[PDB]
């Protein structure tokens, strides 16, 4: 019943190959499927509206039992994202309470949701196009 890392990642890849978020491999021939690129479209009714954020996701040897490492490439002003490195902090709930059933889709969706909390939605954002 436990799907091995490699086949769980093949499952997510297929799902990613076929509307607010997307992801795919950073290297099309990376057989270990470790590094992924992700994108999140900023939520409506916020300072993130119409913005598109690029991210890097690293699914290590123990994924999905262990959560992946997520780093924003696109600059963003969001409390759970380290403002110098772009790294999503370990305390973010999805990472903190990571379950094997969780996927990269779960994480991207949860981050998009975070962009829309009343306190986060009013934060001023960097000029369009800036990177960490």
């Amino acid at each position: 019943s436990k799907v091995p890392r490699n086949f769980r990642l093949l499952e997510e890849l297929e799902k990613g190959e076929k509307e607010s978020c997307s992801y795919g491999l950073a290297d099309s021939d990376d057989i270990t499927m470790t590094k992924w690129n992700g994108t999140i479209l900023g939520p409506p009714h916020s300072n993130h509206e119409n913005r598109i954020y690029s991210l890097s996701i690293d699914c290590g040897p123990n994924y999905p039992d262990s959560p992946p490492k997520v780093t924003f490439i696109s600059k963003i002003n969001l409390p759970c994202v380290n403002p110098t490195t772009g790294e999503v902090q370990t305390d973010f709930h999805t990472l903190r309470d990571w379950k094997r059933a969780y996927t990269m889709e779960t994480l991207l969706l949860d981050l998009r949701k975070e962009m829309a909390t009343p306190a986060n939605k009013k934060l001023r954002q960097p000029k369009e196009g800036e990177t960490f």
């Binding site: 490699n6 093949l10 890849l13 021939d29």
Partner: protein, 152 residues
């Protein structure tokens, strides 16, 4: 659900007691549905110098659902992609409970001996195999030496 289906147990035993020539397949002690598989490159094919490593997993609905398999060894072939995904009819819509793991392994072995760049489902490597078959085969042979395990 406190035990593996008898069919998996029996297929696993038979893969050991009656192995397919050129093929090895054994489950991981910590996951009896996850298999390490090796297939020798067919004699007289561009892959003849090496042994290829694959991984196979039997999903919870097997045998209603097809086994999942893929190559771990990097390979240049028109029906196996850059991530090792295998385009084989019996691993897709044409899988049925009447087939078994052995069927699949034999089919992959045959696919190495007979690449089919003209299949509507072939990958992006197909164009090279159609326009410059001699160069495509030379690259497949070169990659076998660079990436596959060596035969004795």
């Amino acid at each position: 659900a406190a035990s593996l289906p008898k069919r998996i147990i029996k297929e696993t035993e038979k893969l050991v007691s009656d192995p397919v020539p050129g093929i090895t397949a054994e489950p991981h002690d910590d996951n009896l549905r996850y298999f390490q598989v090796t297939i020798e490159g067919p004699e007289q094919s561009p892959y003849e110098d090496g042994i290829f490593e694959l991984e196979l997993y039997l999903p919870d609905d097997y045998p209603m659902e097809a086994p999942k398999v893929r190559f771990l060894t990097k390979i240049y072939h028109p029906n196996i992609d850059r991530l090792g995904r295998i385009c084989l009819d019996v691993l897709k819509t044409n899988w049925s409970p009447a087939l078994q793991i052995r069927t699949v392994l034999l089919s992959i072995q045959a696919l190495l001996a007979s690449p089919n760049p003209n299949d509507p489902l072939a990958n992006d490597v197909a164009e090279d195999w159609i326009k410059n078959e001699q160069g495509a085969k030379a690259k497949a042979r070169e990659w076998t030496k660079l990436y596959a395990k060596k035969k004795p």
